[PDB]
């Protein structure tokens, strides 16, 4: 059986963007993507101040955009919901704090699914590794593929145990 | 003399609080101080409604207290003036964006002074280091120490210099 595996990206404050990038691009680690991904976020936040209100953002629309563009601020649910739509795939965050999965793009009928693992502080990408020398890891799964979600949940359990 | 040393605190929307905490407690880095400091601020704002009114708050007293206690809202001048009274010291903010020092609590005759650095969004605490590493950095200075003002303002002059 192929094994769900974490690949550890740099914890440089941008690990959310770096992890998302890694999975949606099919397994490419490029830390330099982060500034561009943040600017894409700011572009989308500024474009809908009705939705991205002061209530949601905890500050002005403009303030949020400047904030997210920094190299030291952490992406979260707002950023993931945005990236899900932009990349048109489901972004499943597996939360090892209490062992659950938050599924962004849950109800948009994307055909694709990707997974990140999250401990409350760090994000890393997950991928499926194959025991066959010739078959490279896969980071994009079918939305039909519910078994990968189950394996992720177990990996969350194991990761929780190991961390403690 | 030589410029002051910046100690980097997380850009997690509570950086003002963490920075103030760091310097007034003599060099202690603790981001978990933030929910309590916010609560402290809400008490004071609500402890004197006539003073802390919508005129200076920008919203109603109760609205403000609720706002400032969110984990994602920014502290600013209101919080610095309050914390300056509470900790009984001048709080001097080097602004690298505008290139100046804003002094809080100047006219109250506090005996001590702390310094923060600010870029328009993010606060960090400043300190004066000692070559003897066994000697801990100094974060609280005499309110008559002109030299510390200079070592701080140099950081701002240098930032502007770099923009040119």
């Amino acid at each position: 059986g192929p094994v769900l595996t974490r690949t550890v990206v740099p914890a440089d404050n941008s690990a959310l963007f770096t992890s998302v990038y890694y999975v949606v691009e099919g397994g490419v680690l490029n830390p330099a993507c982060a500034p561009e991904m943040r600017r894409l976020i700011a572009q989308i936040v500024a474009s809908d101040p009705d939705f991205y209100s002061e209530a949601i953002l905890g500050k002005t629309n403009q303030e949020y955009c400047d904030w997210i563009k920094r190299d030291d601020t952490w992406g979260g649910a707002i950023e993931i919901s945005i990236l899900s739509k932009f990349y048109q795939c489901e972004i499943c965050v597996v939360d090892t704090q209490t062992v659950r999965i938050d599924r962004f793009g849950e109800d948009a009928g994307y055909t694709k699914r990707v997974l990140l693992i999250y401990d409350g502080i760090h994000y890393d990408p997950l991928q499926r590794n194959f025991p066959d020398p010739d078959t490279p890891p896969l980071t994009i799964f079918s939305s039909n593929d519910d078994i990968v979600l189950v394996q992720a949940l177990e990996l969350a359990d194991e990761a929780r145990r190991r961390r403690q | 003399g030589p410029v002051l040393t910046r100690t980097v605190v997380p850009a997690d929307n509570s950086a003002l609080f963490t920075s103030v905490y760091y310097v007034v407690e003599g060099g202690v880095l603790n981001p978990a101080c933030a929910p309590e400091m916010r609560r402290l601020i809400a008490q004071i704002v609500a402890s004197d409604p006539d003073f802390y009114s919508e005129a200076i708050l920008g919203k109603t007293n109760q609205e403000y207290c609720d706002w400032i206690k969110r984990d994602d809202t920014w502290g600013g001048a209101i919080e610095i003036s309050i914390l300056s009274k509470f900790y009984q010291c001048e709080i001097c903010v080097v602004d690298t964006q505008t290139v100046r020092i804003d002094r809080f609590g100047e006219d109250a005759g506090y005996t001590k002074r702390v310094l923060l650095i600010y870029d328009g969004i993010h606060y960090d605490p400043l300190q004066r280091n000692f070559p003897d590493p066994d000697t801990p950095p100094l974060t609280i200075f005499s309110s008559n120490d002109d030299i510390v003002l200079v070592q701080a303002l140099e950081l701002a002059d240098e930032a502007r210099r770099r923009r040119q």
């Binding site: 914890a11 440089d12 404050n13 941008s14 190299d71 030291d72 502080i121 | 980097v8 997380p10 880095l29």
Partner: peptide, 7 residues
């Protein structure tokens, strides 16, 4: 640095 993140 402790926790910690540096670019």
């Amino acid at each position: 640095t402790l926790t910690g993140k540096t670019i």
